[PDB]
Amino acid sequence: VGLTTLFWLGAIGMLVGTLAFAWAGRDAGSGERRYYVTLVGISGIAAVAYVVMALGVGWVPVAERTVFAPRYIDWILTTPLIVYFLGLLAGLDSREFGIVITLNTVVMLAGFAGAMVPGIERYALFGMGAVAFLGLVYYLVGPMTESASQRSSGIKSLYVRLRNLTVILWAIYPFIWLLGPPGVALLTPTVDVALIVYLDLVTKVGFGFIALDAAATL
């Protein structure tokens, strides 16, 4: 199994999620539609990014490594949508959304920038992202959880389930980044991509399926 193959697998998984979310939201009352649309965009954008990488585009040479630019474009656009989904579920107002969305953006921008910087100073960008990430986790586990507590028992339960999925799985990315080509380059590009393809699929499609389950049960 090579990079190309791993990218195709990611494209296929994202496509399956995209189609399922689009279908399940066919009707969608008039206030629940928002959730389905966000899911379609999250997995849809990732699907495109993976096909692009699978076709060999965006493989940017940096120092003695390769940076998959599409992955980062994908993250920068999709992770804020995931955060939006959680904030909607938690019942946040504009100001609340604004804070978590910017922290999220700082994480992804710093990571992309760090990956694109050849020198050892790139770790300074990585650190910036790590710090903003802790801020994001704080909001997810604190204020946003407090806000969610004002919703029905089911919604609060779905929020908690997805919050846990997000906090735990997202916290893993920085380590894979630090151990792979972007950092120490211990893990080969293939192993790093394999691990990240799984993580992307679960944080997006796994995330979506869990939500659909809750919606159905509700």
Ligand X SMILES: *C/C=C(C)/C=C/C=C(C)/C=C/C1=C(C)CCCC1(C)C
- Residues 56 and 54: their CA atoms lie apart, in Å, by 5
Q: By three-state DSSP, how is residue 32 classified?
A: coil
- Residues 83 and 102: their CA atoms lie apart, in Å, by 10
78: phi > 0 → left, psi -120 to 50 → alpha, else beta; which? alpha
Of these, 86, 107, 148, 211, which contacts ligand X (CB under 6 A)?
A: 107
Q: How far is the CB of 188 from Cl ion (least distance, A)?
A: 12
- Read off the amino acid at residue 33: R
Give the C-alpha distances (Å, rounded to integers) separating 91 from 20, 86, 133: 25, 8, 21
Looking at 47-55, 60-68, 102-110, 208-216, which segment touches ligand X (CB under 6 A)? 102-110
Q: Which 55-114 positions form the footprint of Cl ion (CB under 5 A)?
A: 67-68
Looking at 124-132, 137-145, 187-195, 210-218, which segment touches ligand X (CB under 6 A)? 124-132
Name the DSSP letter for residue 202: I
Of these, 13, 44, 80, 111, which contacts ligand X (CB under 6 A)?
A: 111
Of these, 68, 133, 139, 159, which contacts ligand X (CB under 6 A)?
A: 133
**Stretch (H or E) spanning 44:** helix 33-54
Regarding 165 and contact with ligand X (CB under 6 A), the answer is no
Partner from Cl ion, ligand X, none contacting 207, C-beta within 5 to 8 A by type: none
- Residues 203 and 2: their CA atoms lie apart, in Å, by 23
- Read off the amino acid at residue 163: R
Regarding 147 and contact with ligand X (CB under 6 A), the answer is no
Partner from Cl ion, ligand X, none contacting 67, C-beta within 5 to 8 A by type: Cl ion
- Residues 101 and 113: their CA atoms lie apart, in Å, by 18
- Contact predicate 164/175, CB 8 Å: no
Partner from ligand X, Cl ion, none contacting 68, C-beta within 5 to 8 A by type: Cl ion
Regarding 174 and contact with ligand X (CB under 6 A), the answer is yes
Name the DSSP letter for residue 151: S
Q: Mask of contacts with ligand X, 60-99, x by CB under 6 A? A: ---------------x--xx--x-----------------
Stated length of the chain = 218
Interface residues with ligand X (CB under 6 A) are 46, 75, 78-79, 82, 107-108, 110-111, 126, 129-130, 133, 170, 173-174, 177, 200, 203-204
Interface residues with Cl ion (CB under 5 A) are 67-68
